[PDB]
Amino acid sequence: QCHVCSAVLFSPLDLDAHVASHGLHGRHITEFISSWQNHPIVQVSADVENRKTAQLLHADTPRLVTWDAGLCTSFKIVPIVPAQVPQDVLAYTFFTSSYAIQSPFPEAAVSRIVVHTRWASNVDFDRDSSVIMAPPTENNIHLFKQLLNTETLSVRGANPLMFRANVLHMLLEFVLDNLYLNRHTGFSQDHTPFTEGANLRSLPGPDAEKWYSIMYPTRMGTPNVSKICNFVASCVRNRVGRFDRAQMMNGAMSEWVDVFETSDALTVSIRGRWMARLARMNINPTEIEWALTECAQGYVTVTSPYAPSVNRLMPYRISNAERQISQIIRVMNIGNNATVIQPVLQDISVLLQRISPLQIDPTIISNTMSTVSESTTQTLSPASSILGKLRPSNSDFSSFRVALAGWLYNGVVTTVIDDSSYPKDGGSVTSLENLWDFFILALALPLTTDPCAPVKAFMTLANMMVGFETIPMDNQIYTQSRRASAFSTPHTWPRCFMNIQLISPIDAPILRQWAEIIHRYWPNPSQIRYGTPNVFGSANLFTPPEVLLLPIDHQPANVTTPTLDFTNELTNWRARVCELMKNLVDNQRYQPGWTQSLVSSMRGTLGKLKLIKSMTPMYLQQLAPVELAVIAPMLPFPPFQVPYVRLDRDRVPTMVGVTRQSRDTITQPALSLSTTNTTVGVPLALDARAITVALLSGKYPPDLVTNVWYADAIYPMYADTEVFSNLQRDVITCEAVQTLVTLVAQISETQYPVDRYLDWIPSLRASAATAATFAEWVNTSMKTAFDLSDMLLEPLLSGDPRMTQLAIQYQQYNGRTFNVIPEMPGSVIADCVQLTAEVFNHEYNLFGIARGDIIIGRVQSTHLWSPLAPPPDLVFDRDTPGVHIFGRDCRISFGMNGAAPMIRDETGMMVPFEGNWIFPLALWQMNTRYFNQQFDAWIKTGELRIRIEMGAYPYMLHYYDPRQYANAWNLTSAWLEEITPTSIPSVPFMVPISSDHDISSAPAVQYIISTEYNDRSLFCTNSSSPQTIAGPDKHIPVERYNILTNPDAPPTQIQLPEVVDLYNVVTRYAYETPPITAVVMGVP
């Protein structure tokens, strides 16, 4: 046995596994155990291989906590054009042993940085939304065409009009595949002569010496003279390995540590933000205990012991704004669909059927009416019609509990009495069947959540009394004989029903009495407290967050109340209806043609129906609100309610809508789908006969104890809750909404205030379809990242996704609209993406994008300058004297009789095919195969030089031997041939190779050069020799290895926006996530 939760287990050897759930040292969702019986209940994940007396969790709970044991870096260094050179010192010698020299950086002629996320990362449940960049010598265009090139004319090309969207989605994916928590792992005390006494972290796996060499650049000594050796010598050796540990120790392993290991700043910042968000999200079991006890309404007390620990982590604490936004999304998901809401009511009704102690049995009615019989001579008989119309042999009573369930969901669905339950045709008081149809209908209406129910009740009797009694009419177009089914909207309530005095008692006495009875004795609305507002959020709105509105009023529950307690509203209603009916029947002024005097039998059966052993009114008064409040906070779809009113057609709701635009905009009016309803919500017909018979015949078990019954009923239900998973889903949904609105506002013209880091990338103002498909892609990316199969943000896809804010408002009759705008707090993915874009605009070369524009023109030179960094005299700006700008209306005319052809300048002049031009990329994209046909011949040999201005473009590098003749024409023409109107290929640059020894000088023909400095990824050139002589010069970047080289630099000093830094201070953790446990005690 366990002396913490009293869990009796028959294996005394694995008690450690169970006590680990409580938090004691010697997968699994929740462990609930009762206090009066030996039947524990276990909740298990939905998609496990097998179920062994354990229950599934039918909810796509997001995977928030994911660990990482490898390196927290996403920028790797790849060697290109490798080379080997002699080295003076070959290896390290210690006694009769030798150790090979391992350089932390690749040894090659040219080494440049490339982004490749989680290249060294040992995780569980990979987010899988990885970003893959090939070395620049390969083709990297396969990810700038991911989003909106499904109909591109040419493969291997990317759309300059969609570059910005593609880059934004790539940045989003880069952020998404970094939501991990660093995992603490064992160290190994090093004793190398260069890193004596330090503690080096060892990754799990077969071996770790190679990982040591990669992670720690300072471990390498200074055996040779070289760039790497010089950088190591400049670096300091004090700061390496573990920095400091925590104080709490669970055995000998430290709690949390931070180590000096190779890692970039952006990823560690992102993971720090994520860890901070989770830490502020976490929760502790004592307030979970409080929340469950408060939700149990006092019928059940809950306890949950736990040992004092700090690493315990279970993120469930969220605000109310997230719940409100998720509620709005769930309401919008319906869209007037009768298929999405039917199962919820259908199975909530059966849940209430299994919960409620009230069992319905019409044999009470049968036994009460058995003694009533009628003579063998007379034909028409009241009691036979009563039996045949109540049908006491039918055991289908789903409608009553469906109405009880639908009490909670006004504003999305409304419950009304189904047609054909009304008297046939207009009806007549001279017919017994029509009279008893009126009786059943009037007794059944009050339960329905239809605001026009009193008007229907009055108009039914009015229609049946047409021809005997008269009431005034106003417009002379709606006759008194108007069917009561049409009265389904507040604007149809007659002034006769509004003001009782307009009905003259001298002409319409029975109608006057019925109107007075309806006005006085109609049930009054009330409210009840449900759930636990503080620990769990409240997703209800238009109401205070701790009340449940009920059409019926409620009283404290005690079972020892008289059945004929006329203070009870429903019993009073039934008694008054029966009394008015017998007053109607007495005089026989309304029933001519009845040869036999049926007044005696009618009054007798009306009395026997007025008084009857029915506990349904008492049940609805006392116990039903308690059950509804118990089950309300545990539903997958939280209750969504609208204020109740009776006999007041000024506060009656009429419409419910959802808006996706902010207040300070005048935009094009796009009403939601839910506003296209005659009622406030989706109509839902109900049979009045079942409701009437259920209300008329209901009995309790003869030994009921409320405490025992509800303690026995609540426990299995609370053992199957999914509220925590729903909370995680809700916070994920709010995160997705914020990310979506930010991303759409970035590319589409909207008035959402955001700081636009990246606008230099060319794009177009996206239309509704483009915004919708971009939103679809971001939605599916988030769903893939967080492993959710169910809906997420899909309802926002319908219509115009260029949204700003989510709000919901409902309009009452007189026109006062109540608008609720839930404020949205600062999210995590949105500002992480903003931060990574702020880093991108300073480091765009790493991702493979070159800012600026290219220049096309022959440069026959023997020099060795890199085309990515040209010298100033080979470029010309817009203000360079002697240049010709070009607009769209550029027209080329031939030169007759041996004259130079001329093209139209944007100023209206004509210039020959010679000189320095400024030429937007759109022109060439439009007029390729013509500008190609002429300028291809002219540029190759002539003096024409063209500057194509394009903002940003992907580039692929080509390395040639500087001591051999080379020509870039076969690549420049190749680029210029397939620049189709829909896409362009990556711009091919031809760069030389840095050398160490003296090399010969051979000519080279270059055509494409970049305007500005577009080579920042170049990590190092010839990083094996003491120096480079011929070619681009570049040493190891000291700016990026700051804390090692800078002497007066604190360990937590980072240049976040300007230059990303490697070898940072990453903090590693070790957290426990115990399953939720509770001991479900009873209450006497």
């Binding site: 199975d347 299994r354 379809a769 492993d787």
Partner: protein, 132 residues
């Protein structure tokens, strides 16, 4: 250790104390199994509505009635062929009601021809060719 991924992505002395005893002397009155099945049925997530939404290629993925299908599903949930609770042919006239159909795009036009085909034709309307 590792966790399997649910949805595909990017596919390419000691003695027994006197207290302990297994008796099962108590029978639950509401019915543990009954209420347990009921709450299992109730805890199901709400059915996803995906009609009228775009897809990876931008085409509206909805289908180019719902009340009748809901009535049929209710009648199947019950045992009787006739339905006691119905969403169709009810007295309230709600002709105006609209649903999320696949016939319309996000721009308001008709999906008589898919967006991908329309864009392909628009972009192929004017394309250059090599000289003869």
């Amino acid at each position: 250790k590792r966790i399997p991924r649910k949805t595909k992505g990017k596919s390419s002395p000691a003695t027994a104390e006197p207290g302990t005893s297994n008796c099962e002397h108590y029978k639950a009155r509401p019915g543990i199994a009954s209420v347990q099945k009921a709450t299992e049925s109730a805890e199901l997530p709400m059915k996803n509505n995906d009609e009228g939404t775009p897809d990876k290629r931008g085409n509206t993925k909805g289908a180019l009635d719902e009340a009748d299908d809901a009535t049929k599903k209710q009648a199947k949930d019950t045992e009787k062929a006739k339905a006691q609770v119905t969403y169709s042919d009810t007295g309230i006239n709600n002709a105006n009601e609209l649903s999320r159909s696949g016939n319309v795009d996000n721009e308001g036009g008709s999906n008589q021809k898919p967006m991908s085909t329309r864009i392909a034709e628009a972009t192929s309307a004017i394309v250059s060719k090599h000289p003869a």
